[PDB]
Design a protein around this ligand. Sequence first.
Ligand SMILES: [Zn+2]
Ligand SMILES: [Zn+2]
Lengths: 704, 705
Amino acid sequence: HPNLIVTEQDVANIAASWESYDAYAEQLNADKTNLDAFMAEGVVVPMPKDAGGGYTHEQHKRNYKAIRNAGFLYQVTGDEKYLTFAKDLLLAYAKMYPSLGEHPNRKEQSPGRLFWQSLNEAVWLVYSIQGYDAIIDGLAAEEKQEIESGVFLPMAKFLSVESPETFNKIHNLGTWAVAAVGMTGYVLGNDELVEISLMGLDKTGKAGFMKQLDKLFSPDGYYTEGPYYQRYALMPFIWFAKAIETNEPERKIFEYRNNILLKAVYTTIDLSYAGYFFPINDALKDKGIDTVELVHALAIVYSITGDNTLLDIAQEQGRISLTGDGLKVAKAVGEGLTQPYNYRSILLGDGADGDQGALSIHRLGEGHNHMALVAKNTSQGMGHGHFDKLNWLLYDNGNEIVTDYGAARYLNVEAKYGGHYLAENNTWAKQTIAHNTLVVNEQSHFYGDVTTADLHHPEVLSFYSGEDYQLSSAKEANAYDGVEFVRSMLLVNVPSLEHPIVVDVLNVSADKASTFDLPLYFNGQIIDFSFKVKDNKNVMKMLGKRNGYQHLWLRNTAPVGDASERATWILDDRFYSYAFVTSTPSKKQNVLIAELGANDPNYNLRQQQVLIRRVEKAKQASFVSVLEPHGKYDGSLETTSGAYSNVKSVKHVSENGKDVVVVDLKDGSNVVVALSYNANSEQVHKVNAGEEAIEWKGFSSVVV
Amino acid sequence: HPNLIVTEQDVANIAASWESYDAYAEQLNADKTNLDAFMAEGVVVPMPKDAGGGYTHEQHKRNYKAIRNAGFLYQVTGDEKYLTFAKDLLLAYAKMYPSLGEHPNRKEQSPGRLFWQSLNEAVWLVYSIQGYDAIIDGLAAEEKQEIESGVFLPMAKFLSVESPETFNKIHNLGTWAVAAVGMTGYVLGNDELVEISLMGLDKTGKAGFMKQLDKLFSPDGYYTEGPYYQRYALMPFIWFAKAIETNEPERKIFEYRNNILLKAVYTTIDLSYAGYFFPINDALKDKGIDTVELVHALAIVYSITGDNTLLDIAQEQGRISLTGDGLKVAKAVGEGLTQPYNYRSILLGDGADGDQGALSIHRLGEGHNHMALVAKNTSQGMGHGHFDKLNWLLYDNGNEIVTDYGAARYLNVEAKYGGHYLAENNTWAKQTIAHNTLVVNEQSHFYGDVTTADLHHPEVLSFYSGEDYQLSSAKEANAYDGVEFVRSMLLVNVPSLEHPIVVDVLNVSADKASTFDLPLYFNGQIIDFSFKVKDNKNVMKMLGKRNGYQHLWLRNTAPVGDASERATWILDDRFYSYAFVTSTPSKKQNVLIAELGANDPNYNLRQQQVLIRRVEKAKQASFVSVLEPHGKYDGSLETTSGAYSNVKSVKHVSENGKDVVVVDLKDGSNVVVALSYNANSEQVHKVNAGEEAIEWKGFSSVVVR
Ligand SMILES: [Zn+2]
Ligand SMILES: [Zn+2]
């Protein structure tokens, strides 16, 4: 001991070398200084009382980090003060834990004992058992017995056999539970705890860690719950794997399922823009690559692969894993081995076999400030999933441009419902109207029913990434009774323009006359609209009654017609123009400008504007649009150029289920986008857009 | 020649050493690279057509910068291609200018010819005459005569004798006009043009540059239009002065009025927080210290003073003046001479004599991210002035916390009314309700009448800056008929708390029963309120009918009473709690939460929330509050501490016109703030809270029990 996340050899290597690596030394010294200050407050182990973000919650969190850190520092420095603090913390836990029942401030989640929910209990164990592992050397036999029988064994029992609803779950909560119990099993030498963690309570392998590895990740290493929870689950995945590798290397855990864990780490990195994870499904926007789960996971993967491109990410994180694996990273960075990380367009299959929809990431441009389009054609993602099939996000110039709200939650803010998911997470954040995708009859996809949503996935029709253009196309046939919709999203390189442009074609067909809404949640300040708004008569009323509409204020409506319209806004030093036209037999076409904040008496929702394109009493519609970054605004030097859109108009024609979009540019040139929806590479297609016949081969064509 | 902003000697210094200073060299090379690219597009001088931010507007701007830069680069490098380009641009202007009438896209401002307003014409001349000065010795006599008779003399005539309404004005537009004409006078050796620029068209000194130096700055160097226009006017002030110094050093222009110009530059720096200028009066929020006016002015002042604390600011600007003076800054930074700039609390008198109210800046705490409170007890500031007597702003943690809207304007965005002040600048941005100060009967100070406002200023009652606390107190007796109000604002160092706290006491007396509103414009997301909001029933109506109220939506009302209430919000990693109580005989007290955006069909206004404290049917009220930064939120490591306010309550008692505020803290200690409003430092005062007697000496006392 230790022999889990760090080994005895690791400790020796760290002790001998840690001062020599600037990046490692900075991290350790900062952690040491913070722990010393925490130690000066004495041993503080309060009775559990508060919900998430409350004092006892955050104190017990400080304690588990201190236990792990004190354990580590005792091994590295030899200083008995760290042994004592970790020992006395654990002994205080050992005396208190057996008398604990359910937390008095529980909610709907499986309750903990130290914490309001059992998830945090598992995190406490994952950390605290590492501290214990590193502290065994300086403990008396009587102390080990008090500690094991007092906290660790009772906790491992509580989180496993006493919690089958969590321990057998194929979900990030299950991952945390099996890692906590599994790591405890390895340290305490309890074979039963290890086996049930790997193969489930009944040992058949229907649940447990191995099932999670086979079910929760696609072959590409995409985690079904989404980037934010991929990040979170990555810790118990990679740490339990580490514990398995150091104790039972014969299991070859990092080779399992064609190196799935290695792929999971790379994919986590790939699910970010400018260092922040795509906020799809339940997610917070301030979560980025320096999160500790990815810091530790990167170090482990670098140690295995020697991929010097991971060092670029390591520098961007500005943090180092205080482990043997982290030592290797620090050493490599110091030697100048860093190579740039390759951010590229990727298609990420969803579902165990990668055939249950997909997440598309389209990247175009050089450097950090490139353009990134995300097409969310994924399966539901269970309880944290949003009702937003075929949703999209746009990033450009280091900014979110076309946005996803993420979750309604204030992390560890007790006054905000114990930092837990707020009432508005379900009533607003998950709802279709809160996203950039089709809403039919003011009802969410699958009528907001998670059970129904879990049974279906979008059909990916095409993915293409080239120098000329990029494309994702998908079909959603199951979101509504008697409704089918198809969406194709393109990034187009037009040599005469400063930046790539987005082209969006969303086709909908309905058995009955319906209302079709298509929102665009934008970031920035409106410059102007091409259309005329109706006077709002000095009142804003709630937009609609249900399914998220009750959270929006109607600021203006504006009637629109056959001709394309335009909204232009500014964000930082760049302008963005949204040119849009909808082909439909219905004349009932309006643009609704809305603002977030209705039915929000607790001030839980952010300020947010949205442009919603509405078609009423229609059985069919083609929502076509162009999103164009353009121009330069410099408030420092007080200059501007290219502030007007270069798109004169957008036109759309459909013939025999095939679409042609013509983007007329102000310089007299045009861009023609054609979609056949036929996968056959060699098949020829023809469409008559009034005058001029458009002819092409394949699923798609783009001609400037 | 050159002998204006740069001299022959400056050019010699630059030529000999510019490559030796990394940042100066990088700046020069970037300018060189950018000009080479601009030159490859040829000489492009379009017939004037567009308004602010439009193509012809921005093209003529690119041209004046190109003329100046080409002139400079010709001097430093000796490369003839730069002289040729500057010459060809100027000859193209010389051909076009004589036939130009008023700009076709003018507005209410005095029109230009190249530009929609004459202001930009003056800027064009200021820049272009420098380029000409730098190439004149390399031109044939015929080329000089063509350029001078074709553009420079006609433009100088247009901006001076043909434009008395601007040239003789004591206003930043006047400063730009006299600088442009005066600099032209020096370059062309035209004594008349210099004389009228210094002394006004009639040469009597009733208007002109010297008059502007006397009137527009207070003795402390505070420019009356406010920080945003201070930095703007700083360029023609410092550059015309530089021209005066290089041509007529006997005038001792940088010594004038106890070094008023040097003081103006320091004061400009002092009017910023985290590098951005306080957005009081007409102002844009993205304007900061790297603005070229301050870059050039700083270099000039460093050259004169050798003040090494300016080198700290120079590094923070990340931009250097490509002049002889900027070379000296570059050399000094390179030699490791930088000393930290002394950001300090200051009282800045307003008016030519410093007696017309004051702007207070209070700073407390260590580092760049300290707390700064601004108390706006200033005179009107003419046309750009806002109707916001006794307004305040708060900064903390590198952020604006309690905010001023600035102006409704989108700089050089042609689709936003040619980048000009929008209709909502007058109807929203200038109005009292748009600010953190007292509004009586939903009317703006001076009933929003600039003529009336121009006649009055607040009376400064006290200013104190210590390590224990900071205080400003002022009286406004003229904003409304039959109303007087007094505001005292404090920053208090409480050793037991992690951050200083703001204490605010605003007293109002009215002859007739009135409505008193006090807004607080905050930056961040509400966590929770102590009060209970009334159901808004899924509708937000416009808050009021007039004077800015027509631009606010009412989101919620909540009743309040005798006991103090609390609002807590989060911004980045810190929480902020506003504890507030209002002492008044009236029981008609409410809090209003409002949002900006009513009567804004053009989407000209930003999203913004406000907490408004309202008292109805009152003749007297004391609005008391505490603003407390606290706690830590870390979204990366996922930790929070200290998220609850440490203020248990705030109480206020008044006796014989003297105020006592008691801030009860959760640790059982309390802060007692006492105000006598008597400037006699030795006068003893007594107030009875209930049976507890508070005793102190002087205008104010702050004691932590
Ligand atoms: Zn979402
Ligand atoms: Zn203002």
